[PDB]
């Protein structure tokens, strides 16, 4: 279990609105990395997922032997452990168990979540190029693996209702899932088939971030028209790209008890990878900006239960115009106008302040994470702290041109020294070993 | 415990003399590294020690937060686990437990060894520059830590007889120790004080490798005179630099039961870092070439017991002239003449063939490891397979100029597929994260 | 163990009813304080707990580094020792062991008690402002730590039955607990949820001190109506503020064996901090006056066992109208009428005479302690001796305006010189070091 | 025993000459004080002595019940314990045993020292005003008390040779003593009788600090004449005020084995209180400036042994002109000219840098401590860091006018976090409890 110094400083808003204005990032601290490196120049480690809870943490990433492209073979590394203080005062992520799922099943886009006594992981089995998954009417096989600290492993092929003949494809969002009220929730996304109930119920819906108007040169009517069209992709089998949540009851005999809960397209942008968080008793969702709006998207999720089962989800966006991501064409970090786009990168963000603490939800929110500071290239990894309109502290890593990809950020507090630490898990392009080196950068978020 | 595919292919001579002539190295294989990386540009991870036995493996290395020099602070990372096959057929070193000794005690030059149920580690506590340790008449504090898989940890400050007022300094050789007949043996080295019994008993002794004569231009009398002087260092407090073995009975209340057994200087070169091996029932020793002879030094060690206690050790060298190491001045990879030298690098070697299988011990021996291919710079890390006079297979890693340091090699066989794998743990200079990145390169040693 | 001069003069009624009329306080005596001081101007030491028994004494207090407000970080100082005579004849509290619980767990409102061979401490873990604890339906984590004189420490998270979904919050009373018939008893208080069995069973109950009638201007019916309403707080989550006792069997593997025993609201006032005492074989309880009645509240507690387990408690009040405490608004030291109040200070009192020695329980009781002599400000610390209606001896400490807070009083007798000493542990506001300086004032209670 | 974080960071020069130039004092840190407070307004706690060694620390101070003057009654508080880290990272001095010597023997001017397994304390028995001790030809009784952690206590009246009929008085210097090569050394001072061998051998000797010339307006001949006269006091029985060292072999049956070793008056100023230190293997001495030169006096002491017994001591002064002390009349902090003076205060200093590391001994020395910043009044306690000519970092405590007295400073390093902490034990005048409050201020000495 996690050390007493951390058991009470996890999954919370660590600072007050007033303190948020005076936060800065400290120097990077050196700790033994708990994320394994490749041992060949062409080895590829990508798509990490990290879940940290009161008792322990779970980590996982995908491994491909040659280069970063396969739809046949790949292995998935899973790791779990606890956090303990070092003599220097900062955290050490102690690995207590390691697993390497290597058996021929091509598990991809996996999201992992902490559960009492272990980790629950949700993956889908890839057997063809991503684009092909959208054209085929049949969805990929879905699997959830539960790995207990006692070394028992139970994997199940799941068939949640409302998937077959509704979703041409379904993928976990790769971002962490969360254990909530006896259920494990995972972010999901995919393509919905035209003519289905889901499609019809989503027809004509769209979402436009609160701060777009002042930055977009198009008129309201034009924005609305383009926003509505941004949820349909002709390149991806003419499917409605949808975001959502997969809720699974914690059982070892899962078959069709998990529930697919899609977000209303009136509250969320075009479906994309994502991540779920827990701040106290509130659930939050991070949605990758793979569409027209290039800024960080965070939402407070309200979950409704009907007869002990999740029946509906509602999302309220934290309005910002900060931390853009690199994109292609007319959808780069500089874009501000609605339209159809299918480009971007995963870059979640951690809320250091409570958006509900202001009279108007999210009027003054502070968050931290990493982002690729460029308009169209996945380059210049940069850790930062920002509010709705400005970056108030940042430090680029490496020299300009340094390639990087996804970035998963997680913060917790040492209730002993009373300082907040954040771990920025960044996929860095390496020139020595492997295509990428996923690094768990760690540093303090100083108040002052 | 290790998978059935490996429990019977550990610590043995894998090939016959005839097969040794036809061995070549396979491509590097990609597996998740079990050796942690630094998370800051200046973080320093160095001095690894690796022990692999029938049941499991133990690994450890030193961590310094800023740069690679301290005599005050440092932490020691320890890891342990097993080996299991991946779907591709090659090994995966599964970490089952991790430990980070961070408490203010500056444990250095640690050697680790596998013991039933865990790992036994031997370190010394550094409190001043190495050179100062040789001038001070008092030796550094010595410690042996036993870490059980059940998470019990027992550290003891040891005071073996014949150390105080005999050895100005004492250091573990960093190379792995071995569990032999109920005793844990570790390689050691240090400086002996003038006038002590050990000094007197070693007076006038010297060792000259069998293949030096044909390569040295000096006459026999001159060689002998210089060889005798090579065991005394004026730069290191005028001490006799000695090599040896520390034998500790496996107990949890060690105080003064460990025994310091020095090698006769008539059979070994000037003391240096080292490593102990187990090939069947025979013990072997690797001695770093920190003296005049720049070639790989391996010896078959014969241990004598008197009343259930190790009482004396004898070393028989495997005569070779292959695999030189980079050195300074007149002691570079090109030197062949006796004289006093204090330069070199750690680069052990694994015997793929039995030296005792030939009518004349070691007449035709084959070994594998890594070495820095240059005369004086720690550059061009290169994995190889060689016999007494030639390198018969090699592959440099990275481009020329690539900095590197120590190299620990270990081989084992998959009794299922019937192939031998070797792990080459090499300290590589990195430009991204940390000063060094210790990498567990792994590849097959193919017969053909 | 305590000196022979004190082993037989602890936890008893030291004077007869007749002698009580002639008691006066002696001069303060100077002894080395056994309560540690802060070393910074802003350091805060507060909430002491002191337990003294035949064999030894236990002491503890909370430490906050900056100012006196945190719900995150804080440490708890624990101390234990014995009493021995000085050459001047008076006591010296000799500390034989010290402990500083500093590990990130925010242990608050701790009560300590002497147990055979050590101390047992009961705390709750604070993670949010006190008021928030009453609104949240879930109670704070509860912990009991046993610290043996042999340095063994065992802390357990306890989950006594009837707490979850019954008590929105639960706190130790900070006053000392007592070891009674193999069980350790601690005073407790908190807020009970509406609709629970406890709530229903307490419905319509109330308590009005015997001497209120003659001092209150309201009629009987009005008093009863207001008294009933004084047990419910809208400011504190609309909970029923309850007082009680937590009984724990002396074990090192406590989980859910401790029992929560609430006082009948027909015999006790609104729940508040408190303390338990032992006078011979009788248990007594001190209840802080945080409600409408501002006078010292002491009760003789009758404990019922059913199958070797405490099953019910009954309280009989010692009727007095002496020693008021400062309060806010219409609940100052001058108030005498029932109504809802939530203000006051901790100020226990020691009974120098047996209340059961008079034909009518407590008709003539004498007690000693300290109190803040003012109507609404925590000012003018004053040690005193008083009976049911008047203060018969007192001496203010420092000049008027001197700030102070809690006061814990304990008396014992030197069976050698035959004199009674009382220790008045008072939280004094300091201007030099720290916010407060907890001082163990000691003086004699002279008969004459 | 002390925590692993400190066992290797005690009694050493922590910084290099270069780092000394960039040292500054950090904020005062709050830890539970291990020095007991008085419990009455007139209680007096004074004359502390603190010894810290690899294994543990020893502390002691004198207690007088009414005011700060007695030559009859007084008690001596002794305390011992270890150092351990708090969750905030800084030290906590954990008291593991307390003792209160209260028995009628008026032990004064006590110096304490750490010894294997306990503390050794040296006091003298006062029975009359100090001045009277110098006029009486007989010296006060001398005592050394050894207090073992196992609670065994052995006190012995000692009669070292060369004291009777040589020293009219003899006093421990109150500053800590040190355990060196099996002997416990304590600083001493007193008055020597005219006509004795010691007197004759000291005749015409004198010492003038290296930096006086440039600051004194008198010529060399005049300075020499006045310096010679500064070692004789007509006010104190016309005795030669002498400084020295008392060496006692660690035994439990001491009688006359302790040796009185006086300093040559050619190397030291007029005798005064003092303290001994250990920096590595070198012994250092601090001499209170109770004479004409008002600056901090530190000397490297060279001890000579003859037949296993200390036979002579030599002192080499670290030349400075920094950190003056308040004095009376023509001997205030502003004085620079030789002459007879008998005024000053105890204010030792800790050397953060090695004086022997410069080609010329002490050419660039850095030290830290506290001092009363005023010319003649014991006022304005101020902690500082200084070099030979300037104060490079300082922070006054409290407001101007704040009375204070002695100051004992001690520094050690956390080899885990790699930071140096210093404890400044200062006698502060208090207005609440007691005449003085001896406070163990603690803060870090930051490099930068
Ligand atoms: C490891 O822990 C899990 C979690 O409790 C154990 O799972 C139980 O498995 C049995 C059947 O094998 C179920 O009937 C129980 O309901 C499971 N427990 C629950 C409710 O989670 C698992 O058995 C443990 N591993 C072992 C066998 O020691
Ligand atoms: C985000 O942070 C920025 C920078 O701190 C805020 O901008 C400052 O706003 C204040 C007004 O209160 C001005 O006085 C400063 O001059 C602004 N900084 C500058 C020069 O850019 C910004 O207001 C914050 N956004 C919010 C309100 O969330
Ligand atoms: C080490 O390996 C080398 C290379 O295989 C051996 O050298 C060969 O020796 C044979 C004689 O049996 C010659 O026919 C080859 O021409 C040699 N190779 C060349 C051209 O270098 C060498 O003999 C081996 N060393 C030993 C005997 O251990
Ligand atoms: C310190 O004293 C306690 C009190 O006796 C010892 O506690 C015992 O612990 C064992 C298990 O560790 C229990 O089975 C016993 O029942 C305990 N004794 C009881 C009944 O109180 C403790 O072990 C002592 N410390 C040590 C280990 O010396
Ligand atoms: C509490 O103490 C007071 C003071 O000693 C008692 O008051 C005295 O009562 C007697 C009657 O026996 C009168 O003669 C005195 O004149 C009273 N003192 C004064 C002038 O106030 C009081 O009776 C005691 N309370 C009880 C009975 O417990
Ligand atoms: C506490 O420790 C001391 C230190 O060892 C013990 O002292 C020994 O006392 C005996 C006589 O009582 C001497 O003969 C030994 O030489 C002492 N030891 C030495 C050399 O220091 C002391 O006895 C211990 N307390 C007890 C009695 O347990
Ligand atoms: C003691 O410290 C002072 C302050 O750092 C030193 O004075 C400085 O000396 C340098 C010369 O190297 C000048 O450049 C600075 O201007 C001086 N500071 C000032 C303005 O006072 C002083 O030299 C140190 N004393 C020594 C040499 O030990
Ligand atoms: C943060 O820093 C500003 C600028 O010094 C200060 O005024 C403010 O009080 C700080 N914020 C808080 C309340 O911590
Ligand atoms: C190795 O290869 C050589 C060359 O083809 C072959 O002649 C020899 O038999 C092989 N060695 C053995 C016996 O495996
Ligand atoms: C206390 O003092 C009163 C007044 O002098 C005296 O009459 C009485 O006997 C004393 N009480 C007792 C019995 O100790
Ligand atoms: C201390 O600070 C000075 C000024 O920035 C810097 O130049 C110097 O290198 C530092 N001293 C050292 C060597 O630590
Ligand atoms: Ca499909
Ligand atoms: Ca040495
Ligand atoms: Ca609650
Ligand atoms: Ca005298």
User: Is the shortest distance between the CB of B343 and ligand 3 below 6 Å?
Assistant: no
Contact at 8 Å (CB) between B344 and B272?
Answer: yes
> Separation of A24 CA from ligand 8 center, angstroms?
12
Q: Tokens in use for C27?
A: 């001069």
Separation of first and last alpha carbons in chain C: 32
Strand-pair partners of A118: A115, A148
> Separation of A145 CA from ligand 1 center, angstroms?
14
CA gap C168, C150 in Å, rounded: 37
Contact at 8 Å (CB) between A223 and A229?
Answer: no
Instruction: Count other Cβ atoms within 10 Å, centred on residue B268.
Output: 26
Residue of the CA atom closest to atom 10 of ligand 5:
C21
Contact at 8 Å (CB) between C379 and C326?
Answer: yes
CA gap A51, A55 in Å, rounded: 11
CA gap B249, B244 in Å, rounded: 17
> Separation of D392 CA from ligand 7 center, angstroms?
9
CA gap D358, A43 in Å, rounded: 55
The rounded Cα D192 to chain-centroid distance in angstroms is 21
Q: Tokens in use for C396?
A: 């203010």
* A8 has a chain D CB within 8 A of its CB: no
Instruction: Count other Cβ atoms within 10 Å, centred on residue A116.
Output: 12
> Separation of B196 CA from ligand 8 center, angstroms?
67
The rounded Cα A313 to chain-centroid distance in angstroms is 18
Parallel, antiparallel or unpaired: strands B153-158 and B142-148? antiparallel
| Nearest residue of C to residue A10, measured between CA atoms | C127
User: Is the shortest distance between the CB of A18 and ligand 8 below 6 Å?
Assistant: yes
User: Is the shortest distance between the CB of C22 and ligand 10 below 6 Å?
Assistant: yes
Contact at 8 Å (CB) between B424 and B382?
Answer: no
Sheet-wide strand order for B75-85: B44-52, B57-64, B75-85, B91-101
CA gap A240, A237 in Å, rounded: 9
Q: How far is A274 from chain B (nearest CA, A)?
A: 26
What is residue B417's three-state secondary structure? coil
Region label for C125, one of left (φ > 0), alpha (ψ between -120 and 50) or beta (otherwise):
beta
The rounded Cα B147 to chain-centroid distance in angstroms is 21
- Find tokens 């000196």 and name the residue: C3
Sheet-wide strand order for A142-148: A107-115, A118-125, A142-148, A153-158
Chains that touch D (3 or more CB pairs under 8 A): A, B, C
Half-sphere exposure of D138 (CA within 13 A, CB side): 6
CA gap A399, A335 in Å, rounded: 26
CA nearest to A289, candidates A240, A338, A246: A338
Contact at 8 Å (CB) between C208 and C317?
Answer: no
Contact at 8 Å (CB) between A315 and A287?
Answer: no
* D164 has a chain B CB within 8 A of its CB: no
CA gap D255, D157 in Å, rounded: 7
Question: Kindly report the CA angle at A74 between A70 and A80, in degrees rounded to 5?
Answer: 140
How far are the Cα atoms of A105, B124, B177, B256 from residue B253, in angstroms, in the given order?
49, 18, 19, 9
Instruction: Count other Cβ atoms within 10 Å, centred on residue A401.
Output: 10
CA gap C271, C260 in Å, rounded: 14
Residue of the CA atom closest to atom 7 of ligand 5:
C390
CA gap A282, A288 in Å, rounded: 20
Do D and A touch, 3+ Cβ pairs within 8 Å? The answer is yes
- Contacts of range C195-199, beta carbons closer than 8 Å, 24 or more positions apart: C196/C165, C196/C166, C197/C166, C198/C162, C198/C166, C198/C240, C198/C242, C198/C262, C199/C240
CA gap C298, C387 in Å, rounded: 12
H-only helix segments in B170-324: 197-202, 220-229
List the resolution, Å.
2.5
* Contact at CB, A417 and D5, closer than 8 angstroms: no
Residues 6+ apart with CB under 8 A from A66: A42, A43, A44, B30
Contact at 8 Å (CB) between D23 and D438?
Answer: no
Between positions 23 and 62 of C, the ones with CB within 8 A of D are 28-43, 45
User: Is the shortest distance between the CB of D387 and ligand 7 below 6 Å?
Assistant: yes
* Contact at CB, D8 and B105, closer than 8 angstroms: yes
What is residue B323's three-state secondary structure? coil
Residue of the CA atom closest to atom 12 of ligand 8:
A19
Q: Tokens in use for B61?
A: 């290395």
CA nearest to D53, candidates D86, D83, D98: D83
Strand-pair partners of B391: B386
Q: Which residues surround ligand 12, an ion (CB under 5 A)?
A: A 133, 136, 168-169
CA gap C189, C272 in Å, rounded: 6
CA gap D95, D67 in Å, rounded: 27
> Any idea of the CA torsion for C127, C129, C130, C136, to the nearest 10 degrees?
-70
> Any idea of the CA torsion for A80, A84, A90, A91, to the nearest 10 degrees?
10
Instruction: Count other Cβ atoms within 10 Å, centred on residue A227.
Output: 25
Residues 6+ apart with CB under 8 A from D207: D227, D265, D266, D267, D268, D269, D317
Parallel, antiparallel or unpaired: strands C75-85 and C259-262? unpaired
How far are the Cα atoms of A30, B108, B438, C269 from residue C315, in angstroms, in the given order?
60, 65, 71, 11
Q: Tokens in use for D378?
A: 């014991």
Residue of the CA atom closest to atom 5 of ligand 6:
D117
Instruction: Count other Cβ atoms within 10 Å, centred on residue A14.
Output: 25
Q: Tokens in use for D227?
A: 């310096």
Separation of first and last alpha carbons in chain B: 32
B-chain residues near D3 (CB < 8 A): 103-104
Question: Kindly report the CA angle at B282 between B279 and B285, in degrees rounded to 5?
Answer: 80
Ligand at minimal distance from the CA of C253 is 4
What is residue B136's three-state secondary structure? coil
CA nearest to C176, candidates C410, C12, C345: C410
Residues 6+ apart with CB under 8 A from B326: B332, B333, B344, B345, B372, B374, B375, B376, B377, B378, B379
Q: How far is D118 from chain B (nearest CA, A)?
A: 22
SS (H, E, C) chain C: CCCCCCCCCCCCCCECHHHHCCEEEEEEECCCCCCCCCCCCCCEEEEEEEEECCCCEEEEEEEECCCCCCCCCCEEEEEEEEEEECCCCCEEEEEEEEEEECCCCCEEEEEEEEECCEEEEEEEECCCCHHHHHHCCCCCCEEEEEEECCCCEEEEEECCCCCCCCEEEEEECECCCEEECCEEEEEEEEEECCCCHHHHHHCCCCCCCCCCCCCCCCCHHHHHHHHHHCCEECCCCCEEEEEEEEEEECCCCCCCCCEEEECCCCCCCCCCCEEEEEECCEEEEEECCCCCCCECEEEEEEEEECCCCEEEEEEEECCCCCCECCCCHHHCCCCCCCCCCCCCCCECEEECECHHHCCCCCCCCEEEEEEECCCCCCECEEEEEEECCCEEEEEECCCCCCEEEEEEEEEEEECCCCEEEEEEEEEEECCCCCCEEEEEEEEEEEEC
- The phi, psi pair for C407, rounded to 5°, reads -145, 120
Contact at 8 Å (CB) between A317 and A298?
Answer: yes
Q: Which of D4, D413, D418 is facing B103, going by the closest CB pair? A: D4
Contact at 8 Å (CB) between A202 and A194?
Answer: no
Q: Tokens in use for D193?
A: 């009788």
Q: How far is A66 from chain D (nearest CA, A)?
A: 42
CA gap A364, A267 in Å, rounded: 20
> Separation of A338 CA from ligand 5 center, angstroms?
90
The DSSP letter of residue A233 is E
Nearest-atom number in ligand 3 for the CA of B21 is 5
Question: Kindly report the CA angle at A150 between A147 and A155, in degrees rounded to 5?
Answer: 25
CA gap D106, D119 in Å, rounded: 19
| Nearest residue of D to residue A4, measured between CA atoms | D87
* Burial (CB count within 10 angstroms: exposed 0-12, middle 13-18, buried 19+), residue B77: buried
> What's the Rg (C-alpha) of chain C?
20
> Separation of A122 CA from ligand 7 center, angstroms?
65
Q: Which CATH number fits the domain that encloses residue B148?
A: 2.120.10.10
Instruction: Specify the DSSP element, H or E, that contains B91.
Output: strand B91-101
Q: Tokens in use for A432?
A: 């020595």
* Contact at CB, A98 and B102, closer than 8 angstroms: no
* Contact at CB, D8 and B104, closer than 8 angstroms: yes
Strand-pair partners of D400: none
> Separation of B446 CA from ligand 9 center, angstroms?
12
Interface probe with D: pick from C98, C106, C399, C435, most Cβ of D within 10 Å: C98
Q: Which of D88, D414, D416 is facing A417, going by the closest CB pair? A: D88
Best probe residue, ligand 9, of B22, B352, B418 (max atoms within 8 Å of C-beta) = B22
Q: Which of B28, B77, B434 is facing A39, going by the closest CB pair? A: B28
| Nearest residue of C to residue A6, measured between CA atoms | C104
Contact at 8 Å (CB) between B80 and B145?
Answer: no
Q: Tokens in use for A343?
A: 């480009």
Question: Kindly report the CA angle at D294 between D289 and D300, in degrees rounded to 5?
Answer: 55
Q: Tokens in use for B90?
A: 């090659």
Strand-pair partners of D442: D29, D423
CA nearest to A119, candidates A76, A92, A149: A149
- Find tokens 């060694």 and name the residue: D53
Q: Tokens in use for B149?
A: 């898989």
* Burial (CB count within 10 angstroms: exposed 0-12, middle 13-18, buried 19+), residue D367: buried
> What's the Rg (C-alpha) of chain A?
20
Residues 6+ apart with CB under 8 A from C319: C209, C210, C211, C362, C363, C388
Q: How far is D244 from chain A (nearest CA, A)?
A: 42
Q: Output b/e per residue, B243-252; b: 16+ Cβ within 10 A.
A: bbbbbbeeee
CA gap C276, C284 in Å, rounded: 6
* Contact at CB, B73 and D415, closer than 8 angstroms: yes
Instruction: Count other Cβ atoms within 10 Å, centred on residue B36.
Output: 26
CA gap A256, A148 in Å, rounded: 21
The number of distinct structural domains making up chain C is 1
Region label for D443, one of left (φ > 0), alpha (ψ between -120 and 50) or beta (otherwise):
beta
Instruction: Count other Cβ atoms within 10 Å, centred on residue A400.
Output: 9
Q: Tokens in use for C199?
A: 């709530």
How far are the Cα atoms of A60, B401, C172, C382, D22 from residue A406, in angstroms, in the given order?
14, 32, 49, 66, 42
| Nearest residue of B to residue A150, measured between CA atoms | B96
Q: How far is A413 from chain D (nearest CA, A)?
A: 13
Q: Tokens in use for C378?
A: 């925590």
Q: Tokens in use for C44?
A: 């805060």
| Percentages (nearest 5) of helix, strand, coil residues in chain B | 5, 45, 45
User: Is the shortest distance between the CB of C18 and ligand 10 below 6 Å?
Assistant: yes
* D416 has a chain A CB within 8 A of its CB: yes
Between positions 396 and 415 of D, the ones with CB within 8 A of A are 414
Q: Tokens in use for D172?
A: 């421990």
The DSSP letter of residue B140 is P
Domain range holding D198? 1-448
């Amino acid at each position: 279990i996690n050390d007493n110094r951390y058991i009470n400083g996890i999954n919370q808003f660590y600072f007050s609105i007033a303190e948020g204005r005076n936060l800065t990032l400290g120097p990077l601290l050196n700790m033994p990395s708990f994320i394994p490196t490749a041992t060949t120049p062409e080895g590829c480690t990508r798509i990490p997922s990290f879940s940290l809870t009161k008792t322990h943490w779970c980590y996982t990433h995908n491994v491909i032997l040659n280069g970063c492209q396969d739809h046949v073979s790949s292995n998935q590394f899973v790791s779990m452990g606890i956090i303990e203080p070092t003599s220097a005062g900062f955290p050490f992520f102690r690995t207590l168990k390691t697993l390497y799922l290597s058996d021929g099943v091509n598990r991809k886009s996996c999201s992992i979540s902490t559960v009492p006594g272990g980790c629950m992981m949700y993956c889908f089995v890839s057997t063809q190029p991503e684009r092909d998954d959208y054209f085929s009417a049949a969805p990929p096989e879905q699997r959830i693996i539960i790995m207990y600290y006692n070394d028992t492993i139970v994997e199940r092929i799941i068939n949640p209702p409302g998937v077959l003949d509704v979703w041409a494809t379904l993928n976990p969002g790769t971002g962490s899932g969360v254990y909530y009220l006896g259920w494990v929730l995972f972010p999901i996304y995919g393509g919905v088939i035209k003519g289905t109930s889901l499609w019809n119920n989503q027809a004509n819906k769209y979402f436009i971030p609160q701060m777009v108007a002042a930055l977009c040169s198009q008129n309201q009517a034009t924005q609305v028209q383009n926003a509505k069209s941004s949820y349909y992709s002709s390149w991806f089998g003419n499917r409605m790209i949808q975001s959502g949540i997969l809720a699974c009851p914690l059982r070892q005999d899962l078959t069709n008890e998990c529930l697919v809960l899609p977000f209303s397209n009136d509250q969320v942008l075009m479906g994309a990878e994502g991540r779920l968080y827990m701040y106290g008793d509130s659930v939050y969702y991070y949605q990758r900006s793979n569409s027209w709006w290039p800024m960080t998207m965070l939402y407070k999720v309200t979950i409704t239960f009907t007869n002990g089962q999740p029946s509906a989800i509602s999302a309220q966006n934290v309005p910002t115009q900060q931390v853009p991501r690199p994109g292609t064409g007319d959808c780069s970090a500089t874009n501000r106008c609605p339209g159809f786009c299918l480009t971007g990168v995963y870059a979640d963000a951690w809320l250091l302040t409570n958006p509900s603490s202001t009279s108007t939800f999210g009027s003054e929110a502070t968050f931290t994470g990493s982002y690729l500071n460029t308009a169209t290239q996945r380059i210049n990894p940069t850790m930062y702290i920002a509010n709705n309109t400005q970056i108030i502290s940042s430090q680029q890593f490496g020299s300009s041109g340094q390639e990087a990809a996804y970035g998963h950020t997680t913060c917790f507090r040492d209730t002993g020294s009373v300082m907040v630490y954040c771990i920025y898990i960044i996929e860095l392009s390496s020139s020595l070993l492997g295509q990428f080196q996923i690094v768990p950068f760690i540093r303090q978020v100083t108040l002052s």
